[PDB]
């Protein structure tokens, strides 16, 4: 079938390699997943050793991490914003690793009110908020799009391999990199 | 097909098949030792050639070398054991002086002629092959049996032979049947 060998590749001299075996099963590749936005549908793939590799088709949600705060929240993917491979993969809204997506931002605001106590008053007994909040500060570009409603984020998992759409929120120079390329 | 039992060749034909000097020596050796064919001489050539070649390799090696103390005391041991060299000859240069009649004297066809158990050397080859000579109470039917030095004391007639202590042979026994029907 699809193979991953160098039998069809030309030599560095430019010479053709003459083939004297059949294709092996141990050198196969398989058809790509092309994971998109949509309600979750997965198909497992029986890999070597009997292990299962879960193809992701049509994913809509994942655990996205806010790395300065070292937390994650299960949020819902909204749109696919920028892809470094092609602009055609943005238009069909394919989920790959490292593509830039927008996520829900509601569990992140709610966590930022429950932890640090800052909204965008009720437990007067526990002001361990004051034990934090002094040294720590929050980047302004995060807090703008956090209250705007959707946060740009980066996919850190391989969905056709794992069947998950986990990610990380863009911070720092990495957010300021991709904000220039969009607008 | 998957059989790993080994076999090699024990004789070699000479270069130059018609040398008038060589053909005269080998007819003397077939007569003085009672031999069937020239091939029995030619394995005694190759037996002695291999001794003459290893002992000439060991003299390239110095003394107090490991392959000359071992394996040079082995080739002097088998010359002393089979009667190829008497016990005075111990220097390893005497293996290079061995001749084909020095090996042919140690065949059981020759000792049975030399010990006195047979009138001629063609009497000895018959009596070996017709099961009359025992080396150590072991009937040996091979004329090319190389007799050791320690075996010379014990060559005698076989204990099952009619000439020894066994039953009488054929011409007496088929005559003893013909005198029985009458």
């Amino acid at each position: 079938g699809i193979v991953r060998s160098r039998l069809h590749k030309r030599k560095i001299t430019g010479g053709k390699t003459k083939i004297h075996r059949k294709r092996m099963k141990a050198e196969l590749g398989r058809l790509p997943a092309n994971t998109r936005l949509g309600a979750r549908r997965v198909s497992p793939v029986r890999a070597r050793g009997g292990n299962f590799k879960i193809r992701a088709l049509r994913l809509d949600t994942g655990n996205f991490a806010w790395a300065s705060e070292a937390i994650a929240h299960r949020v819902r993917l909204l749109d696919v914003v920028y892809n470094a491979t092609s602009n055609e993969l943005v238009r069909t809204k394919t989920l790959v690793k490292n593509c830039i997506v927008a996520v829900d931002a509601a569990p992140f605001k709610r966590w930022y009110a429950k932890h640090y106590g800052i909204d965008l008053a009720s437990p007067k007994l526990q002001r361990e908020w004051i034990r934090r909040r002094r040294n720590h500060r929050v980047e302004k570009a995060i807090a703008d799009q956090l209250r705007e409603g959707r946060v740009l984020a980066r996919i850190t998992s391989r969905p056709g391999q794992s069947g998950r759409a986990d990610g990380i929120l863009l911070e720092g120079a990495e957010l300021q990199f991709y904000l220039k390329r969009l607008e | 097909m998957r059989n790993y039992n080994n076999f090699n060749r024990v004789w070699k034909a000479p270069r130059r098949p018609f040398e008038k000097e060589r053909l005269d020596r080998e007819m003397k050796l077939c007569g003085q030792y009672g031999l069937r064919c020239k091939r029995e001489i030619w394995r005694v050539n190759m037996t002695l050639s291999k001794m003459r070649r290893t002992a000439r390799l060991l003299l390239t090696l110095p003394e107090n070398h490991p392959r000359r103390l071992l394996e040079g005391s082995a080739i002097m041991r088998r010359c002393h054991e089979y009667g190829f060299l008497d016990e005075e000859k111990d220097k390893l240069d005497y293996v290079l002086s061995l001749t084909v009649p020095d090996i042919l004297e140690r065949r059981l066809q020759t000792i049975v002629f030399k010990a006195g158990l047979a009138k001629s050397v063609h009497h000895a080859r018959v009596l070996i092959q017709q099961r009359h000579i025992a080396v150590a109470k072991q009937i040996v039917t091979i004329p090319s049996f190389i007799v050791r030095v320690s075996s010379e004391r014990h060559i005698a007639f076989a204990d099952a032979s009619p000439f020894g202590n066994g039953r009488p042979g054929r011409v007496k026994r088929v005559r003893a049947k013909a005198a029985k029907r009458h």
């Binding site: - | 998957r2 059989n3 790993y4 039992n5 490991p66 103390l69 071992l70």
Partner: protein
Amino acid sequence: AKKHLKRLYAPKDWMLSKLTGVFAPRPRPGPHKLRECLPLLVIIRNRLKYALNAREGEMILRQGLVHVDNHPRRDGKYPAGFMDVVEIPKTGDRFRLMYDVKGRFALVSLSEAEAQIKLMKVVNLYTATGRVPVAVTHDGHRIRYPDPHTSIGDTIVYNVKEKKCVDLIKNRQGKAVIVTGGANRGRIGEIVKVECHPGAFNIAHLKDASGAEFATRAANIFVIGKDLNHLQVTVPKQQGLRMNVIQEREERLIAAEARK
């Protein structure tokens, strides 16, 4: 997946004659390596003559009558290798697999107290789940809580009945080893100097009881005591001393002539 050995591709230390059949008993995976073991059909039939063929040989093993390290082994293809203890309760004999100085496997007879401990060399150390640091051994054992001074090159004394690591022997300069691979296999010597060479094979220089100096790779040495007198385990009848090939050839001719 190979399942067969040819008797020519079998190891030479087993000493199976080439003319008796095409095949040799391929030892299963298990404790010891295929190149470096002696499977129990060869011990029961070819070493010990308790069995005349392989059909009498599984009447012994499948019945549960041979114990390798206190546990009955019903496999004729079980890999028994170095430092293993083979007991038989019915015939009342127990043996230890050691290398003799010519490199071959040798069955050293044992007492009851010497047959409880075996000596095992660490091959890997890692941390398992929990935070339990286990020690991987050449015989395939995974001791879970070893002596905290265990490093990789060391030797653990084990006591296979009560599965408790009773002792440790570190690998240092002042120790005595047995060589379990290479040309020098079966020889016993003090350690002289260990040449490190990181990224490649450690070389270990060794001196024998007579004073013969010889070297191996340090993955081939197996430390068995604090010195050559205080060995933790009993060794075969030459005790790691390799005689000259000339002198040992003279002695057999002298012994054969003096016997007659």
